[PDB]
């Protein structure tokens, strides 16, 4: 033991004594085995100096036969100098020891007997050796530590993996996803004080080779090395090896003030020989090294615990996936590493970054953000070539050395490589080290291997492969290769045969690639250039890959795991965007995006945002200053942030899987204030970047203006840029000098100082302080709140409910666990305080902490799912200890005490379950499934696949998605919450803890004066809610497994997976599929419930009975109601019988079956919670005047007659009709009460009354804040819901209640309805029963016309080969919507004659659009719609402002001087007279001869859409007057077009009613409506893969025949169309069919049709057979035959 080894330690070694004590030999034991080779060496420094003398000596020390060949002669010399450097710092520590022995007579006091070794900063004196008068370190304990410090210096940051997200939020107070760019990347440079010394203290303990004492105070087993590690950290920062930095984000944050210090270690020279082998000392002193690179057969072990979660043990299923990943082998790519080193590190930075950087040509705020951008690349560049240098030393061929990596399980159940820079995280290393390989036959360009080769190249160059067919993708790829990228490819071809690059290589690549610049784009060019120069193209070996990426993986996974209740048609359509197709076998994502829908979930959320903003803006028609504030915010965003779809799509940033999109951030529970800060930070970054362009433009020409140097590329003239500058300055001052505030449901503007003034000064421009705060306040109220409503509309309101309950349960559980852990360490400190041995400054033992942690097991802290384990509250906090661990000898650096204890989870509950169970289980299954794909790199939600296994590995990836979607996150969380309620005691919590749980369990009004019994009642109510959500999810997954599905979530190739369901759901509309799925949902509910327990005509096909008008007249007597109100029904009966009201009633099954047969949408109200109660309600169809009842009684039938009649008066009043004067006052009186209804205080009411009020408000406000529904319909619905609430709560409020404000409201509304029902005649006295407890329970159905913005925005992103797939037109159509379509009035359009002035311009412009296409300019359906819409926008503006087309006249006249007929002829010297005729036809239209005034707007519109005309125009010379701008004629024409529309945008955004332009806009909206519906008809008419009119028609008829009806010869015809002989196809097709015998199967079918041969088949069976043969011949002869002919050429013609 330690008594035997170095027994010359100072002090007494006894456990207890009265004299001085040495606690080192007590807190540390002696392991029996060997861990450090210097345990028995007095002088370890000379033990390694002799070890590193030569290769022969190095072999014997480590006890192995062979060493790493990289230990060559050069690195021996470099280690000798570094070893001497460690000796230089060894003597430095001696000097500080001598100073301590005499300064402040500490040694003299130590000589007296004072226990200074037990102090905060004296723990280092437990090891100091005795020399009598003087004292000194034990030499062995000192030398072994320096080697730990030296090895730490080289690999301090290399081994530091990616920091966890939870830790970053803890040290900042803001979620890492909402942090601005640059600061997040700054973590690689700086590490906090605790992190710097804890890492160094880990090495020191390991190098000593000792064992901790489990029964010793934590202030000695952990504080002794930490105190000495800080000493070694000193004299290292003294040599400037580490720098000191202070954070600024929290410093500049208007609210946060938590300053954080950072520590960054300086790098080393990239050419250092020591960089070729930096792990010589580590692998010599140690026995089993942990810092290693695995070559050949070296396989890493499997970790037994999670990452930074020692309490969680890896499950046996998890350990199988970790083993599989580390078995994959990697090889370097030789061509890339040779290309990288020729460019150099500096040229790489210029290409990838923003060019060369200098303080003169950069904004102050913009320049500092590039430091973190450039820091990552240089570190990654150095790391890659350090690894390669080690590989090259082991073999002559560097491309044949296998390399293995390490993996571990993170806190959310993902797999992450160990190391900061690796192929998983860094993208520079990704293209040099790959595990994929393939062999292809490229001798023919029509092969199938060439098609897969093209897919890899197209995806690398930023082409959306997962949205187009494989034929369309090849068309666009070839254009780039022979077009813009041609100069770059030619340069690359020269490099492959010369090894040299042009001087201006960086400039060439920037012009070629453009905005597609990425490290994978250079890979595509290298492989293509290698292909051209190869001679034998039949055995090409390439590492090119294609990644299978998920389509909105985040939101889609959450939508399938935390959704309950019945199915809805909205859910079916929205889930299709993720790749879940119902009733469509063998369907792929490419087919869906080409014929069904091209809008993803990210775009759908944005569309709903603009509808909510329009509704909010419309409510302030009487408050002009508020409206102008909204327009300023929108105008500023368009100038700098065209699209808000943020993400991890950068170029020089590491990949961590963090979600930074506004849609995903909101769902994960981020705060509203936090979101607004992130959006503001993006806008200001774009402003700062523009300030770095004016500085550069000034250098080239110091005479230009500020407007020219900023908005030059977007200006059509000199004066246009002046308008843009003035608009930008006006908007900026308004936002930063005014703030919106909320005053009882309305917004009021207030002044808070002054904003930015008139001075740019691009070098020193900054927005900060009070101006920054006013920016975020404007965005929070005007942008974030409308954004939340739009998200709830897409993902559904059922998922939002489940997220709130999950967050509340996880927050409450973590707060309790945090309080009891702190309450039990305070007891042990008090118990140990009386112990004489214990002394303040120590802490608990390791065993005591273990028992306290094990004492909370009855509260169920961990969640188990059967394959994964989660510990949300786990963290390495420091607030629990609230002490000081140790400090430096100069009392400068103080290290606090950190323990592994539970911590508050905040709002981390939601992202934990979505990622761990949705994506983690998906990607863990893929590794361990039967037949898993091999040789793939998987990052977090993608998987790189070699080109030889794409079609099969992409199908097993989709299969793993299906298995992942069978989990239940809510059920697993509930199982732990139920046990937590079983062993908790709320009366033993701290006063602050009870306050924290109150904020989650209770509302605002009931928060103050909260009783403990009130906290427990609400806390136990959440447990009931989770039980109902879990039950609903379980039934949903069981039902979905019984139908046929096709899953294409993770795919970019077109290989889906089938679930082999047996119930057919095809040939149905989305509303029909919901009815079928809801039937099975209720069937499963009935079976479980029974398990525990063990007058009118009738329809023929169902038990439903029908009651018509004039059939319930006698029912007045049957009810035997009082005679005073009996006469009322006699009047109600007459009214409803006048408009043909019929009543349908039956059992729930009978009434549901009737709807399916008659195609009726039902609105029955019942839930699983209501199923236990057992009450069903019907619905009313106001469109056709039909009432549907479920199991009616005498009371309910009477209640509905007086309810339907009442709603008719409400509908008529709000439709602009006239009503009785008595009814008009009653509705008006009710309307006024509703205004005060939503402003009451319910804090003094009964708990059961609060729930009723809460439900009413949520549904009422939804109708009022709805923008896509007709306001007349929405207004009536809101009032109808108000009456139902009052009648429902009359009984329970009239008794056992006080006279509260809400109670009086119930009594008033009841009387208000009484006057409305009875009219002007006398009503029954107050307090009398209405109709034996009258109630309103049936729902209403209402429909109306959709708005213009609804249909125009639907077809914006349509694209297809038969429809048109021009990308430039879609982007042009997007900017049109922002300027024109968004500002149209929300009311639905009408049809009036509209005689006026602008209406003449639109009629004239419509005729010219058609006339242009009939006189030489053919257009597709996509080009036609954009041509019509844009021209009508310029036509109405020119009819209001006569000088709008002044600039376009100058450009039109200049073009006419350099135009000739020969410009329109492909062959200038053709002989066919028809070729010249068509060219002359196009010339006349441009000259205006054919068109024969609104002629100018048509030309301006045509010059933007047509692609053939723009090619001719761009080659014309530029006038000398416009040479200053520096733009071609085509861009000058497109910039003039937006100027006209921008002027019109201001016209519609002002006071339309007073300007007398309201009628003119109503004419423009009609034209947009007409053109939107026309492109909705051409689309869906080509909705087939072939895009043919006939093919689509045949498919519709076939599916309509299978609905009513409720093989061999197909192979022979395939052989006829696949003949490759040449001598056989020359004999005709009659001979082949006669020789092919195919005439016999045809005879059998026709013989049945004619009747010669008898058969038992019906008509529908034979019709399905004849129509199946026709489609077979069309498929083979029109599609497959042309491919055979084209396959005989070795080229693409």
Numbering used by the authors: 1008 to 2101, 2124 to 2521, 2529 to 2642, 2664 to 2750
Give sentences copied directly from the paper behind this entry:
Single particle analysis (SPA) of cryomicrographs revealed a heterogeneous mix of particles with two predominant and two minor populations. 1007–2101) and a tightly bound complex of RNAP and CTD with an unresolved NTD, referred to as ΔNv-RNAP tight complex (res. N4 isolated RNAP and ΔN-vRNAP tight complex were real-space refined to a model to map correlation coefficients of CC = 0.90 and 0.84, respectively. The tight complex of the RNAP and CTD forms a compact structure where the CTD binds the RNAP on the opposing face of the DNA hairpin promoter binding site 24, leaving the region open for promoter binding. Despite a large binding interface of 1,659 Å2, PISA analysis of the C2 and RNAP interface indicates a weak interaction with a ΔG of nearly zero at −0.2. Interestingly, interactions are slightly stronger at a ΔG of Ȓ2.1 for RNAP to C1 with a 725 Å2 interface. A salt bridge between D2012 (RNAP) and R2279 (C1) likely serves as a clasp for stabilizing the tight complex, which is not predicted to be stable in solution. The CTD buries a large surface area of the RNAP occupied by the fingers and palm including the palm insertion and extended foot domains, but despite the extensive interface, the overall structure of the N4 RNAP domain is relatively unchanged in complex with the CTD (RMSD 3.7 Å), barring a few changes in subdomains unique to N4 and a subtle shift of the fingers. Cryo-EM reconstructions of the four high-resolution states provide clear evidence that the CTD drives the B-motif loop into the active site in a conformation that we predict is inactive. Although the CTD makes sparse contacts with RNAP, it allosterically regulates three crucial motifs of the RNAP core: the intercalating beta-hairpin, the B-motif loop, and the N4 plug module, thereby repressing transcriptional activity.
